[PDB]
Design an enzyme around this catalytic site. Structure first.
Site, PDB file in Angstrom:
ATOM      1  N   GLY A  31      37.960  58.189  42.073  1.00 52.37           N
ATOM      2  CA  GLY A  31      36.930  57.983  41.066  1.00 52.37           C
ATOM      3  C   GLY A  31      37.527  57.246  39.880  1.00 52.37           C
ATOM      4  O   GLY A  31      37.743  56.030  39.931  1.00 52.37           O
ATOM      5  N   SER A  32      37.815  57.996  38.824  1.00 51.10           N
ATOM      6  CA  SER A  32      38.349  57.448  37.569  1.00 51.10           C
ATOM      7  C   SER A  32      38.479  58.545  36.497  1.00 51.10           C
ATOM      8  O   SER A  32      38.468  58.261  35.295  1.00 51.10           O
ATOM      9  CB  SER A  32      37.427  56.331  37.045  1.00 51.10           C
ATOM     10  OG  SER A  32      36.062  56.740  37.070  1.00 51.10           O
ATOM     11  N   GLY A  33      38.625  59.791  36.944  1.00 58.50           N
ATOM     12  CA  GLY A  33      38.360  60.953  36.106  1.00 58.50           C
ATOM     13  C   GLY A  33      36.878  61.259  35.980  1.00 58.50           C
ATOM     14  O   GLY A  33      36.503  62.188  35.261  1.00 58.50           O
ATOM     15  N   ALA A  34      36.044  60.497  36.696  1.00 58.22           N
ATOM     16  CA  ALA A  34      34.573  60.603  36.614  1.00 58.22           C
ATOM     17  C   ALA A  34      33.974  61.779  37.392  1.00 58.22           C
ATOM     18  O   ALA A  34      32.897  62.256  37.046  1.00 58.22           O
ATOM     19  CB  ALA A  34      33.924  59.298  37.083  1.00 58.22           C
ATOM     20  N   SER A  75      39.021  66.281  38.251  1.00 54.01           N
ATOM     21  CA  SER A  75      40.284  66.093  38.954  1.00 54.01           C
ATOM     22  C   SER A  75      39.984  66.031  40.440  1.00 54.01           C
ATOM     23  O   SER A  75      39.944  67.069  41.107  1.00 54.01           O
ATOM     24  CB  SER A  75      41.259  67.231  38.663  1.00 54.01           C
ATOM     25  OG  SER A  75      42.046  66.961  37.514  1.00 54.01           O
ATOM     26  N   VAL A  76      39.739  64.814  40.935  1.00 52.90           N
ATOM     27  CA  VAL A  76      39.557  64.562  42.365  1.00 52.90           C
ATOM     28  C   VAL A  76      40.654  63.641  42.945  1.00 52.90           C
ATOM     29  O   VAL A  76      40.969  62.585  42.394  1.00 52.90           O
ATOM     30  CB  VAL A  76      38.167  63.963  42.680  1.00 52.90           C
ATOM     31  CG1 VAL A  76      37.971  63.806  44.193  1.00 52.90           C
ATOM     32  CG2 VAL A  76      37.084  64.852  42.119  1.00 52.90           C
ATOM     33  N   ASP A  83      27.078  66.232  44.438  1.00 53.14           N
ATOM     34  CA  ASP A  83      27.209  66.430  43.031  1.00 53.14           C
ATOM     35  C   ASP A  83      25.885  66.937  42.489  1.00 53.14           C
ATOM     36  O   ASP A  83      25.123  66.213  41.867  1.00 53.14           O
ATOM     37  CB  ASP A  83      27.656  65.126  42.365  1.00 53.14           C
ATOM     38  CG  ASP A  83      28.541  65.367  41.179  1.00 53.14           C
ATOM     39  OD1 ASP A  83      28.379  66.427  40.517  1.00 53.14           O
ATOM     40  OD2 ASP A  83      29.419  64.510  40.919  1.00 53.14           O
TER      41      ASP A  83
HETATM   42  N1  LIG Z   1      33.248  63.198  48.387  1.00 55.93           N
HETATM   43  C1  LIG Z   1      33.799  62.341  47.450  1.00 55.93           C
HETATM   44  N2  LIG Z   1      34.458  61.260  47.854  1.00 55.93           N
HETATM   45  C2  LIG Z   1      34.995  60.411  46.990  1.00 55.93           C
HETATM   46  C3  LIG Z   1      34.875  60.618  45.620  1.00 55.93           C
HETATM   47  C4  LIG Z   1      34.166  61.724  45.154  1.00 55.93           C
HETATM   48  C5  LIG Z   1      33.626  62.613  46.091  1.00 55.93           C
HETATM   49  O1  LIG Z   1      32.912  63.717  45.710  1.00 55.93           O
HETATM   50  C6  LIG Z   1      33.476  64.345  44.528  1.00 55.93           C
HETATM   51  C7  LIG Z   1      33.005  65.788  44.565  1.00 55.93           C
HETATM   52  C8  LIG Z   1      31.899  66.195  43.859  1.00 55.93           C
HETATM   53  C9  LIG Z   1      31.443  67.521  43.930  1.00 55.93           C
HETATM   54  C10 LIG Z   1      32.078  68.469  44.702  1.00 55.93           C
HETATM   55  C11 LIG Z   1      33.218  68.096  45.440  1.00 55.93           C
HETATM   56  C12 LIG Z   1      33.901  69.017  46.249  1.00 55.93           C
HETATM   57  C13 LIG Z   1      34.990  68.582  46.935  1.00 55.93           C
HETATM   58  C14 LIG Z   1      35.451  67.276  46.882  1.00 55.93           C
HETATM   59  C15 LIG Z   1      34.827  66.354  46.125  1.00 55.93           C
HETATM   60  C16 LIG Z   1      33.692  66.733  45.377  1.00 55.93           C
END
Ligand SMILES: Nc1ncccc1OCc1cccc2ccccc12
Length: 351
Positions: free
Chosen positions: A28-31, A34-35, A165
């Protein structure tokens, strides 16, 4: 059995995750929080792994952490985010402090496909069909997304779509201020807080999304809340006495009545060249009085989606107990509740 974890610093935070997950890099971008993207060697899937930031710092945060986990554990539908995994490095409740969630790596969202690619009427059928199918499932568990916009809609190369989301950490007054996509897809009754809202608000968001796939342009890109109401009422007409009665907010109702009465416009002249069936659906989604909106289940039967509609393949959700929502618990009580949900997690069946 408990897997072995390894530890690594990934943008200012120490990620501790099971060995199965390799090649973590910030995404993402911090968007999205923390992913990290990662490779899951056990399933061969490319996944996003979210580490929840400070999940039990307050009662609000503890409950929110519990909410998100609960919701993601429930969702088992082709057009909705599914939980691949949830884990903690902690071997006990006493050391429990971090939650990590795993789903499929998105790659592209619907802004990417609207902005960068050109859409045939049959792409719009398919894209909207899928949003409505997942919405039928969600709404059947009395779940409300509240935040449907192109950026929480994942689309793959085969134009297959997921609702992600659920927007769980509700928005700041400031995030909702001015010329922002965060407000453009919101039903008027929430934007302006006219009444206790319900699941019909997502159908409004669908209309706004569908119009933008048809046109390539934002339906109501208001420079602010009031400018955006004006855009809305210009298309849809000012409310009648029937809808005014329903607006509980005396203040909000007094403001709308300040406006000069406007009739609903002709959508065939707004959406020039659009499939008449697209236009007709739009008219039934973009209804100011939410009691009168087409529901997701009614919309799936609409002639615009005859190509895709199968009533034996538009499933509903198992029942979802969210009686916890009206419950007052302390941090540690929410935290333990969350811990049990982590411990009881069962992975999705293998193919
Ligand atoms: N699936 C994705 N692929 C690329 C970027 C962001 C993503 O979703 C981000 C996201 C949003 C909400 C819950 C989540 C739970 C686990 C993993 C990610 C989550």
């Amino acid at each position: 059995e408990r897997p072995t974890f390894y530890r690594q610093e990934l943008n200012k935070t120490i990620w501790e995750v099971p060995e199965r997950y390799q090649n973590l890099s910030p995404v993402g971008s911090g968007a999205y929080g923390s992913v990290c993207a990662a490779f899951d060697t056990k399933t061969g899937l490319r996944v996003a792994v979210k580490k929840l930031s400070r999940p039990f710092q307050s009662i609000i945060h503890a409950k929110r952490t519990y909410r998100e986990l609960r919701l993601l554990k429930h969702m088992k539908h082709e057009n909705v985010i599914g939980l691949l995994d949830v884990f903690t490095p902690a071997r006990s409740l006493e050391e429990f402090n971090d939650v990590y969630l795993v789903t499929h790596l998105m790659g592209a969202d619907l802004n990417n496909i609207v902005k960068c690619q050109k859409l045939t009427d049959d792409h719009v059928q398919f894209l909207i069909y899928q949003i409505l199918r997942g919405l039928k499932y969600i709404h059947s568990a009395d779940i409300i997304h509240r935040d449907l916009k192109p950026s929480n809609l994942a689309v793959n190369e085969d134009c297959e779509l997921k609702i992600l989301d659920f927007g769980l950490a509700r928005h700041t007054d400031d995030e909702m201020t001015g010329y922002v996509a965060t407000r453009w897809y919101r039903a008027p009754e929430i934007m302006l807080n006219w009444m206790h809202y319900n699941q019909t608000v997502d159908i409004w968001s669908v209309g706004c999304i569908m119009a933008e796939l048809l046109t390539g342009r934002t339906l109501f890109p208001g420079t602010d809340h009031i400018d955006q109401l004006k855009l809305i009422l210009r298309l849809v007409g000012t409310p009648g006495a029937e809808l005014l009665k329903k607006i509980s907010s005396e203040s909000a109702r007094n403001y709308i009545q300040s406006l000069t009465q406007m009739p609903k416009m002709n959508f065939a002249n707004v959406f020039i060249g659009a499939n008449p069936l697209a236009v007709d659906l739009l008219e039934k989604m973009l209804v100011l009085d939410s009691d009168k909106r087409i529901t997701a289940a009614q919309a799936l039967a609409h002639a615009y989606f005859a190509q895709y509609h199968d009533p034996d393949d538009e499933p509903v959700a198992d029942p979802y107990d969210q009686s916890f929502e009206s419950r007052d618990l302390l941090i540690d009580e929410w935290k333990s509740l969350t811990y049990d949900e982590v411990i009881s997690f069962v992975p999705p069946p293998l193919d």
